Design a protein around this ligand. Structure first.
Ligand SMILES: CCCCCCCC/C=C/CCCCCCCC(=O)O
Ligand SMILES: CCCCCCCC/C=C\CCCCCCCC(=O)O
Lengths: 185, 181
C-alpha cells in the first residue's frame, strides 16, 4: 500500500505498469524519495550503474572530505554547469559529481593557471554533454523494443548498460590521448 | 650534428645545438630529430603514447581480431590520418588500438551507424578540449627569454606530472555527464 503514494494520479494500464516498475526499483535499492523526484523513474537503476549512489553533498562537505579549496571548487562546479544552488551549504551535488570537481585543484598545485583550468573544465564539459546525448540515443535505440513495458525497458537497460560501463572509461581516456598526440604532431 | 642543424645560423643554431644534444641523450634518434620540425616536443610525445610506431588498419584488425570494415569507419570518424588504404602504414599504433575498441560496443547490440556517429561527436569535442589544454600548458612552460632547451625540459617535467591526472579526470567527467543525460 506504500507504492500508492508513488503511483499518484496514474490510471489504467499505465498505473499497473508503473506499479511493477516501482516494485522492481525499490528492490534495486532505489528510494521512494528518488522515485518521487524523477519523472519518469524508468532508468533510475541505470543511473546508479553510472555512479549515482543515492547520496548528496554540499560544496563545503566536498572541500572538507578531499581537502581542497572551497572557492576554487565552486568555480569548477559553475564551469561544469550541472548544479543550480550556489550556496556552499546546499546539499545538492551527487557525491560522485563532488569527487570529480575536486580533481581540479591538483592541476593548479602543479602550476597551471586557475583561470585557464576553469576554462578547460567548461570546454571539456560542453564537448562531453554532446557526446553523452548521442550515447543516450544510441543506448535507447538498443533498449526500446516495440511493445516493451516500463519494467521490460528497465531490466533490459540494467543488463545492457552493466556490460557497457567497464568499456566506457578506458575508451574516453584513449580518445583524449589520441587528441593530445595530434596536437603535438 | 651539423646535418641536424641545417641552415640555422647565429643564436638559433646555438640553441638548436643544445636541444639536439639533450634529445640524443634522452634516446631520440638523429632520424627522428631530422623528421620533426621543430624537434622541441620529441621527448614529450612518448608521455602521451606516441612512440613513433605506425600500423596499417589491416594489421590492427589481425592483431586485435576486429572487423576491418568497421575499424576503417571508426578511423574516418576520428579523421586524423590522411588515409584510406587498409594496407597503408599511416596510423599511430596507439590510435589504432583506440579504434579497435568500437567492435565490442557493436557486438553488444549497439547500431554501428550510431556508434560511428558517437565517435565523430566525441572526437570533435575532445579536439577543442585538447586545444585549450595546449594553451594552458604553454602558459605554464613559456618564460620570458626561454631557450628551446629550457622549453623542452620544462615541457617534459610538467607533462610527466600532469599525464597521470588526465585519464582519471576525463573518465570522471564523462560519467558525470551520463548521470545527468
Ligand atoms: C570507439 C568509441 C565507441 C563509442 C561507444 C558508444 C557508447 C554507447 C553508449 C553508452 C551508453 C551509456 C548510457 C548510460 C545511461 C544513463 C542513463 C541514466 O543516467 O539514467
Ligand atoms: C576538469 C578539471 C580541470 C583539469 C583541466 C586539465 C588541464 C590540462 C592542461 C595541460 C595538460 C596537457 C598536456 C599536453 C599539453 C602539450 C604540452 C606542450 O605544449 O608541448
Amino acid at each position: 500500500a506504500n507504492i500508492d503514494d508513488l503511483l499518484g494520479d496514474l490510471g489504467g494500464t499505465a498505473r499497473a505498469e508503473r506499479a511493477k516498475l516501482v516494485e522492481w526499483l525499490l528492490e534495486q535499492g532505489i528510494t521512494p524519495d528518488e522515485i518521487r523526484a524523477t519523472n519518469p523513474p524508468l532508468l533510475l537503476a541505470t543511473r546508479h550503474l553510472v555512479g549515482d549512489d543515492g547520496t548528496y553533498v554540499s560544496a563545503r562537505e566536498i572541500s572538507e572530505n578531499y581537502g581542497v579549496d572551497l572557492e576554487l571548487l565552486q568555480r569548477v562546479q559553475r564551469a561544469v554547469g550541472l548544479a543550480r544552488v550556489d550556496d556552499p551549504d546546499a546539499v545538492v551535488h551527487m557525491r560522485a559529481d563532488g569527487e570529480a570537481a575536486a580533481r581540479a585543484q591538483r592541476f593548479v598545485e602543479l602550476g597551471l593557471n586557475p583561470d585557464q583550468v576553469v576554462l578547460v573544465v567548461r570546454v571539456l564539459a560542453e564537448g562531453l554533454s554532446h557526446a553523452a546525448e548521442a550515447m543516450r540515443y544510441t543506448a535507447l535505440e538498443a533498449i526500446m523494443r516495440p511493445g516493451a513495458t516500463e519494467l521490460d525497458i528497465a531490466k533490459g537497460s540494467q543488463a545492457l548498460v552493466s556490460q557497457i560501463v567497464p568499456l566506457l572509461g578506458p575508451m574516453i581516456q584513449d580518445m583524449l590521448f589520441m587528441q593530445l598526440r595530434h596536437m603535438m604532431e
